[PDB]
Structures are given as C-alpha cells and as structure tokens.
Design an enzyme around this catalytic site. Structure first.
Site, mmCIF file in Angstrom:
data_model
loop_
_atom_site.group_PDB
_atom_site.id
_atom_site.type_symbol
_atom_site.label_atom_id
_atom_site.label_comp_id
_atom_site.label_asym_id
_atom_site.label_seq_id
_atom_site.Cartn_x
_atom_site.Cartn_y
_atom_site.Cartn_z
ATOM 1 N N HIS A 1 0.827 -1.216 0.000
ATOM 2 C CA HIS A 1 0.000 0.000 0.000
ATOM 3 C C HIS A 1 0.858 1.262 0.000
ATOM 4 C CE1 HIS A 1 -2.806 -3.105 1.146
ATOM 5 N NE2 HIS A 1 -2.136 -3.300 2.271
ATOM 6 N N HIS B 1 5.351 6.984 6.793
ATOM 7 C CA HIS B 1 5.069 6.585 5.435
ATOM 8 C C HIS B 1 4.514 7.806 4.727
ATOM 9 C CE1 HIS B 1 1.368 6.081 7.751
ATOM 10 N NE2 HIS B 1 0.753 6.473 6.647
ATOM 11 N N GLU C 1 -3.875 13.455 1.492
ATOM 12 C CA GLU C 1 -5.131 12.948 2.090
ATOM 13 C C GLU C 1 -5.916 14.119 2.701
ATOM 14 O OE1 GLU C 1 -4.044 9.341 4.378
ATOM 15 O OE2 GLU C 1 -4.787 8.452 2.558
ATOM 16 N N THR D 1 -6.126 4.327 6.450
ATOM 17 C CA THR D 1 -6.232 3.030 5.757
ATOM 18 C C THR D 1 -6.958 2.040 6.660
ATOM 19 O OG1 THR D 1 -4.118 2.291 6.656
ATOM 20 C CG2 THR D 1 -4.074 3.478 4.622
HETATM 21 C C1 LIG Z 1 -0.942 1.852 8.855
HETATM 22 C C2 LIG Z 1 -1.182 3.242 9.372
HETATM 23 O O1 LIG Z 1 -0.916 3.467 10.672
HETATM 24 C C3 LIG Z 1 -1.135 4.689 11.133
HETATM 25 C C4 LIG Z 1 -1.589 5.705 10.398
HETATM 26 C C5 LIG Z 1 -1.884 5.529 9.041
HETATM 27 S S1 LIG Z 1 -2.467 6.792 8.053
HETATM 28 C C6 LIG Z 1 -1.660 4.205 8.514
HETATM 29 O O2 LIG Z 1 -1.903 3.967 7.278
HETATM 30 ZN ZN LIG Z 2 -0.983 7.560 6.311
#
Ligand SMILES: Cc1occc(=S)c1O
Ligand SMILES: [Zn+2]
EC number: 4.2.1.1
Length: 257
Positions: A61, A91, A103, A196
């Site tokens: 992802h 990320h 986002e 997500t």
């Molecule tokens: C996997 C995950 O964990 C924390 C925040 C977000 S936006 C995310 O995708």
């Molecule tokens: Zn995120």
C-alpha cells in the site's frame, strides 16, 4: 483484499470495515476560515534527536520506515496531547500527478503528497494496545509540494529501488527524520482515524501548515514503486490516498493566530 483501485478502493472499504462511515474518520478538508485559534494549546514538542530507524518496507500500500520504539527515544508531546507519544514509523501517500496525492486538503487544495509520522501513547504500553484507545495515536502530517529538492529525503528515495514490490524490505538504519520537517511547527489539530483499513478511530491529528518542497525527480521515484509483488503484472504504486471524509461533529483547532 482492500486497495486503491476501482474494485477494492475507498468506496468499497466500508463493507469489511464499517467504521469507514463512522463519526471521526480521516482525512478531512481543513477549512482555514472555520478553524479556530485555540489559546489553550501548549507549545508542540518534537524530539527526534535519538531516533533510531531500523528498516524500510513496501507493504503493498505504501512504504514504511520503521523505528526502534523499545525505548524512550523519538517523542512527540505538547500541543493538544496529554503525555508522551513514541514514534513508530513513517510513510507517505502520493499521487499519479503533482496536482493530487495528499489525504488532508486545505481549503479543498490537494498537495502532491503527504507524510505521516505515527506515534503511540506510551501510557498504553505498546502500539497494539494503543490502537484500542480513543487517544492511542498521534499522527504528525506534513504536506509535500513539488519545487526544490528536500535533501533529507534523498536517502529514502535512493533505497526505493531495492523495495520495488510488495513484501520487500531493506535495512534502513541511522535515518534522521528531522530532515523531513519544515521550519514552522504551526498546525491544525482534530480527532480522527487511520486513513487506511482498519481505519481505527484512535488518532489525534496534528497537520502542519507549512509544506516541505521535494523535487519532481524525488516524487517521480515514489511513483516507480509497485503495489504488486515480484513476478506479478506491474501496477504502479500511485494514488494511494483516501479522499476527504465528512467532518461531522468536529472542530479543527489552529495553533496560530
Ligand atoms: C498503517 C497506518 O498506521 C497509522 C496511520 C496511518 S495513516 C496508517 O496507514
Ligand atoms: Zn498515512
């Protein structure tokens, strides 16, 4: 399983994850005119000098840079938060084109990408227990626009070759997250969720007003990543962003006048 395409994308997620249509979903549009300065916010404190990165991972992802959170080393506190939140991973989400990819939006404006620095509330012991709590997580969101290069992002860009496809990881030690921060810590804050699946409503969002600039060549390399695994038909990793969700019963507070 869930993804960002026509058949398994954001409009489908509610089926497996009914909280998708819940009362504090993320991301949202930041209407700068409706957000209110909040004089009760303490100053924000981002302490990343002892941060210890371990690994970078393409999870199909996005890619995560993961940190050793076994000790008290890279913390976020102050602002809206009570107590201490520990950095666990960062990320990004990004677009197929520079006109889209964030986002959160700011007066409906979409940035080219958005960085998420994820922290868990240390009163809950670990990340897994924190995500069962309404104040379990704090995510620092930083917008990226395309212009000048960000030097502190290049080590991340250079390692992307080695994690092209789902399930690949590489050693990623001694990366300094400070080199991803803009000058100002002016921010908006509101209560929300992971963006997500499983979309848990456990997040205090702290979204910085000042974007960082990255180069077209840097963001081009994010777009060469793959959603699929090695030996599979190529689907470029692009447009891995969820759109803005209903604000519902929430107010966005500004840290600045
Ligand atoms: C996997 C995950 O964990 C924390 C925040 C977000 S936006 C995310 O995708
Ligand atoms: Zn995120």
């Amino acid at each position: 399983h869930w993804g960002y395409g026509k058949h398994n994308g954001p409009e489908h997620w509610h089926k497996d994850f009914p909280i998708a249509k819940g009362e504090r979903q993320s991301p949202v549009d930041i209407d700068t005119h409706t957000a209110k300065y909040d004089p009760s916010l303490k100053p924000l404190s981002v302490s990343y000098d002892q941060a210890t990165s371990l690994r970078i991972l393409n999870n199909g992802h996005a890619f995560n840079v993961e940190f050793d959170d076994s000790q008290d080393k890279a913390v976020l506190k102050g602002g809206p938060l009570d107590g201490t939140y520990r950095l666990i991973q960062f990320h990004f989400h990004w677009g197929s084109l520079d006109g889209q990819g964030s986002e959160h939006t700011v007066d409906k404006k979409k940035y080219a990408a958005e960085l998420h620095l994820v922290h868990w509330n240390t009163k809950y012991g670990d990340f897994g227990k924190a995500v069962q709590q309404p104040d379990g997580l704090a995510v620092l969101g930083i917008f990226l626009k395309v212009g000048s290069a960000k030097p502190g992002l290049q080590k991340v860009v250079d390692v992307l070759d080695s994690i092209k496809t789902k399930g690949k990881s590489a050693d990623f030690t001694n990366f300094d997250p400070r080199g991803l921060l803009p000058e100002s810590l002016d921010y908006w804050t509101y209560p929300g969720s992971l963006t997500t699946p499983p979309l848990l409503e456990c997040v205090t969002w702290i979204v910085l007003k000042e974007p960082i600039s990255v180069s077209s060549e840097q963001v081009l390399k994010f777009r060469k990543l793959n959603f699929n695994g090695e030996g599979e038909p190529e689907e470029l990793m692009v447009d891995n962003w969820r759109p803005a969700q209903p604000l519902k019963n929430r107010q966005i507070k500004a840290s600045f006048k």
